[model samples]
Target: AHHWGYGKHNGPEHWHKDFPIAKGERQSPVDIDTHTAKYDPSLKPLSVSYDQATSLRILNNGHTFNVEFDDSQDKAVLKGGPLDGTYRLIQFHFHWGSHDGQGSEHTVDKKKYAAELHLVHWNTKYGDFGKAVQQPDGLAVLGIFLKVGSANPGLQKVVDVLDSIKTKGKSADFTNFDPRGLLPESLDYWTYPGSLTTPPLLECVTWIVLKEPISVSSEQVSKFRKLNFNGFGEPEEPMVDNWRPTQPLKNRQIKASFKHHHHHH
Candidate 1:
């Protein structure tokens, strides 16, 4: 049975039954306790290059809506920082809340943002996403926090496409969108070893979460809730609060590329 979802009966808590690895050591979406996050000078500044020409279509997979990219070459690549090798950006997805209280998977100082964006990239050494996912060092996911505030023009482009892909399993042509426009000015981030927040919960992701958040209008967030989690002709369930809660950090060390909100006497 494909019994995995954000429902009361089939949510994150129930995932351990089907995927025992859910209780693994390096789980993702862990709370980034700022006080405990150690500054690491060894970690380099992150570098990214994304071409609008590589942008492709968007899809609503019930779980979340995502935009796919033409990553056949090094069109959009992420390097330096926590990642050892060049990784190719294949797709980007989002997790949001029913309201503004909480939604982000990875939180800072236990603070949740209105939403979170995950940009998934696979190491070129492993070739494709399929061959790469199984390895320990296969994937690197860049996490961007989205706080509710003034409208973001870059995000508006994505919002406009949501109406077309409102139903589950729906897709629409989304072209010429550059990922660079979605980034915050500062690339300083926190790095850690973690797994996928969703099921199968593979412990293969090098989680790089940004310190600064990009803004999104409250009205824009309402559009995300308009998406349906259920399939067409099925009882329509509005997709909201689609984020997984912060998991245990266990004994893993969280390294910060730069000190956050630095202050001294």
Candidate 2:
């Protein structure tokens, strides 16, 4: 049984009991203080190429729904922008809340978004995800903030299938969907050394969070609650408020790829 679920009995505050690293020095989903973020000239532009055909399916893995990908080869990979080598696309998932005001894990000046999309990738040099997760510089995750605005067609395609996987451990075939469609027009990002937000909180992730946020209607976000955290024939519990609270920054530095005219010392 999953000892950790987003509830009063086993929420983020209680995770430190089982997994001590839950409150580690380099935990993820920190509030992005734009004013304090230094613009790094060394950080190059991010390069992303996802083969639409490589998309496998979307599954409800109890915690959140993940869109698994085909990582057999280096078909879909991300490079540049704070990463030394190419990181193969493993899967993409989301974290949302009960309402539109606060759901995003990494906040911008303590401001939360409607949701956050995480595109998980593993370093190619490590051979596979299992092996890469052990190394300190093994994973590269792209965090995209989602704001409530006009309807997003890219999200609609995935939202239409929420009914199929209404319960935990359910999945369905999902292909021909390019992850780039979900990206904002700008690829500018803030990079930093951080760990995974979920359990087993591996401190190997090089987080590259986009400065621009994509638009999505509130209705699209509401559909997410239909998916239950419990399995079929069990007590139905709608999945919501599945994001972990922001962690302390400690002494880590967050570098921004884009220069802000107003962020002066």
Candidate 3:
């Protein structure tokens, strides 16, 4: 059985212990104080097509409702994957606080969002994930932070499918869903090299965090609270908290294209 491990109190400090480097590495939750909005019209909206991704699968990893994806599906003409040109889509998932007030792992200039969504992809150009995992720019993640609002239009597609994998150690057959449907209209983002927010702290990732946040109704967020992570054999549970503690910025600068008062140039 696969078990998620944490060093001591199963807290952030313990996670750093599991991946010793994580303690000193550039972690998230940094404050972006000097954000400058560039008025460059050259900034374009990110285009993701059905060709870039195959299907979205629902996985019950005893933590949250994760969705595994196919890399061959990337459609971006310049480069299907965000950073690594040969990257492949692996999976995606979400993190949130037990309640409606908090849950996001990455904070902007000391501000936290309602939730965070991570679309994890691997660098196929460098071969398998094991080989690419060590490279700082190997993996690519499309991060979208969700704020609490009236109706979560971006999530309507997945919300309809949640009933399929409503149990721990359980998953459902999900196909034909396009991730592009969930993408924000703004392409301006903050780019940087980082490690997996989870344990093992693999440093093979290039993160592209969008500057704009999509809205998710407080009611929709409530649905995610119903997930379980203890597995099928354990007592019934609800997956309330799945966020890794904010890691240190580690001297790494998260570069955002957009600035205040202006769009990404």
Candidate 4:
């Protein structure tokens, strides 16, 4: 099933042949642009209970580390900066481009970062992320653009585990890992009520794209490119260009929350 989106054979454009409804549906690789915030609410800063309240759970159905964040602590903190709201931490995931220099969904002045991190959250208004994902404006996603440069200090904590699950359908053991440690200190974000970049593109979440990208060593980016998507009936192939094409604005507006009310690099 996953093999459908592979190479010159077939891409997202032909996905509808397999699933008809896909024609009218919204897809990813959205060319993210700038916007103005209509309403500015003061949200409380988040506090982490750290400990075991948060941890990374890695999975290997193929591709790369499809990590699931567990926030059982009930202590959802707001890493306060902008786009204020009480967000109950749900989980986070990564999306990358096949190339080293471009991948992030939101491009800054037309340049795509190496990768993008989606820290998903459910607003208290929707009770929990599980339920928030059901509402049009019930969830929020903190988008962190990561460029390939110096080795990402935080990622090293779990990078070694990649060796164990280098092949497709193989996932390594990654326990007791703190997600916050990976967050870039900057909180400047560009926001918009949008859909998840992945399939089943339900337009229910709010997106917050960080203006300042965090750095991840170029070598680290290669690890993602090396991921194997080849399955039992497939050939040994590298998981490259896993990103979806950017979608149309569809008349939807995107907002930015930056310092001094000015957007920067």
Q: Score each candidate by Cα lDDT.
A: 0.91, 0.91, 0.67, 0.62
Which residue pairs overlap in candidate 1's backbone?
A: none
Q: Candidate 2's residue-wise lDDT over 1-265, tens digit each?
A: 4599899999898988888988789999899888788999999999998754288999999889999999988889999888998899999999999999988999998999999999999999999999999988999999999999999998998999989999999999998778878889999999999999988888999999999999989999999877889998999888999999999999999999988654773
Whole-model alpha-carbon lDDT for candidate 2: 0.91
Candidate 4: residue 65 lDDT (0-100):
57
lDDT of 3 by residue, 1-265 (tens): 3235422356566664446766656655444544532233344434344355666578877667787766554442223323435556677788887887678877766677778898776666667666777777777777888888878665876777776666776878777767776667787776666778776777767777777888888888888887765665678667776777666565676655556543333
RMSD vs true structure, all candidates: 1.4, 1.1, 3.5, 3.9
Per-residue CA lDDT of candidate 4, range 99-178, in tens?
Answer: 78666766654677878887777667666667776777666677788888889877876666666655677765566677
Clashes of 2: 0
* Cα lDDT for residue 217, candidate 3: 88
* Candidate 1, 89-125: lDDT as tens digits: 9999999999987889998888999999999999999
Task: Provide the global lDDT of candidate 4 against the true structure.
Answer: 0.62
The clash number for model 1 is: 0
Candidate 1 is scored at a TM of 0.97
Instruction: List ranges where model 4 is wrong by over 4 Å.
Output: 1-6, 15-29, 35-53, 76-86, 123-131, 259-265
Flag regions of model 3 displaced more than 4 Å: 1-8, 34-52, 73-84, 261-265
In model 4, how large is the Cα lDDT of residue 201?
Answer: 53
Ranked candidates (TM-score, high to low): 2, 1, 3, 4
